[PDB]
Write a protein that binds this ligand. Structure first.
Ligand SMILES: CC(C)CCC[C@@H](C)[C@H]1CC[C@H]2[C@@H]3CC=C4C[C@@H](OC(=O)CCC(=O)O)CC[C@]4(C)[C@H]3CC[C@]12C
Ligand SMILES: CC(C)CCC[C@@H](C)[C@H]1CC[C@H]2[C@@H]3CC=C4C[C@@H](OC(=O)CCC(=O)O)CC[C@]4(C)[C@H]3CC[C@]12C
Ligand SMILES: CC(C)CCC[C@@H](C)[C@H]1CC[C@H]2[C@@H]3CC=C4C[C@@H](OC(=O)CCC(=O)O)CC[C@]4(C)[C@H]3CC[C@]12C
Ligand SMILES: CC(C)CCC[C@@H](C)[C@H]1CC[C@H]2[C@@H]3CC=C4C[C@@H](OC(=O)CCC(=O)O)CC[C@]4(C)[C@H]3CC[C@]12C
Lengths: 218, 212
């Protein structure tokens, strides 16, 4: 029988098996890094391996592996892995296989680890709020730097997200600071707001009544 | 981080999704998807439900990129569009009897395709074996669209669909044993005669009116 239809080619079986264990490893690493999200900072080597192994297949086995069937496992699985990378925006915080993005990401994760070191020994949620308050603001200021940088260095679209483990690290500590520790203290200027608002809202009452009364008098 | 009892519902789902993805690939070129790791897909679906049964908050919607949700959606979409439900029974712990019958027929059909290589003998020795396999496949095409009430005949189990396409391409394309009967001369004669009728009708109508 021809070594294409009923069975795999000798050089196509190994290529498919090589891509098989690479895709299995990436999928296992994706789940283990789902919570807390350490996706782009842990799965970046395995994702590159999968993409490279896709290229070797799609170079002498492309016909027998890529579009040989109605359902294309290798195409959809690699497309799914690509979509996961793009949606996670792991291109950010990864400058051509480099861990950082102009050292911004390692600095953020170093700051995030430093910031989270406060929230452990400052409990025994009172002493955390004022002791290293600037540590949270230092991290929070840096995060806003990347948002504007992401619209200048990258310039994809206003509102584009950064790489997910950076974005998740902000939310881990934002919810750990303004929600569990209640260290957020807005001033809540209320009585002057009420006095000013009722004064402005009372102006149309004067204007319409005075206009009506003045016309009636004359 | 998560509590240790929460890094048990994600670690077991991790190795379950890893081995399912490993099988999805190594069972792709000769498509044996729905028949090799139908239990691995069931394990993933069950272990996903275990999470939603005390870690749903901490794992499912805890962040923007819901990895477990999209991974399970991808596995579900792969199973659904591959129509692997047709391959196994309704209770779905073993292959259907009809599907099991097709697979051994496919092995039986492919047996002569190798036996009769040493393609004149192939087209004669078990030509009926190809037709009984082809008839059975068409039988499931209509049976499938009545079982699940699908209006068109679109997609069977990908193992069955690929097995037939392997045989069809091995029979009508490489062994070219499919020889349709053509009568070009009788077709030309009748088609020319019919196409010549409007010529007579329009000319006779024109000539009849010209004559007074
Ligand atoms: C005199 C006529 C023509 C206008 C009347 C206007 C009132 C119907 C409005 C104007 C300002 C409003 C107030 C503006 C702000 C607040 C605070 C709000 O809740 C808070 O205390 C929030 C405090 C915070 O967010 O820090 C409750 C409603 C109240 C009293 C509002 C009640 C309705 C008020 C008095
Ligand atoms: C929910 C609200 C705050 C949205 C904004 C709408 C109001 C601020 C506006 C809508 C119509 C306005 C009113 C339109 C007409 C008049 C009549 C005017 O006096 C009269 O009744 C004159 C005629 C008469 O004397 O019978 C006094 C102002 C008043 C109530 C206006 C006050 C301001 C009003 C309530
Ligand atoms: C008398 C006037 C008014 C009409 C003349 C019509 C012709 C121009 C047509 C009618 C039938 C046609 C034929 C019908 C079928 C065929 C077979 C066809 O051969 C195949 O492709 C056979 C193999 C296959 O089926 O793939 C080649 C064209 C031919 C000769 C056609 C050529 C053009 C023909 C002669
Ligand atoms: C076969 C497919 C590709 C085309 C289908 C259309 C033809 C079969 C039809 C279209 C117009 C028809 C023609 C319309 C009018 C005439 C004129 C008629 O008489 C004349 O030639 C004299 C008319 C005059 O002197 O006014 C003869 C048939 C003919 C050619 C008809 C023959 C059949 C034709 C070509």
């Amino acid at each position: 029988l021809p070594p294409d239809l009923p069975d795999l080619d000798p050089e196509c079986r190994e290529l498919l098996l090589d891509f098989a264990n690479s895709s299995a490893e990436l999928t296992g690493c994706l789940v283990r890094s789902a919570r807390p999200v350490r996706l782009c900072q842990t799965c970046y080597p395995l994702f590159q391996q999968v993409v490279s192994k896709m290229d070797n297949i799609s170079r002498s086995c492309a016909r027998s592996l890529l579009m040989a069937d109605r359902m294309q496992i290798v195409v959809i699985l690699s497309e799914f892995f690509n979509t996961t990378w793009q949606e996670a925006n792991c291109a950010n915080c990864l400058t051509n296989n480099s861990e950082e993005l102009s050292n911004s990401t390692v600095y953020f994760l170093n700051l995030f680890n430093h910031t989270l070191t406060c929230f452990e020994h400052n409990l025994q949620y009172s002493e955390v709020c004022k002791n290293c308050r600037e540590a949270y603001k230092t991290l929070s200021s840096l995060y806003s730097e990347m948002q504007k940088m992401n619209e200048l260095e990258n310039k994809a679209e206003p509102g584009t997200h950064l790489c997910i483990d950076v974005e998740d690290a902000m939310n881990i500590t934002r919810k750990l600071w303004s929600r569990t520790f209640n260290c957020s203290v807005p001033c809540s200027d209320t009585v002057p707001v009420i006095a000013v608002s009722v004064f402005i809202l009372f102006l149309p009452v004067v204007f319409y009544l005075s206009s009506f009364l003045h016309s009636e008098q004359k």
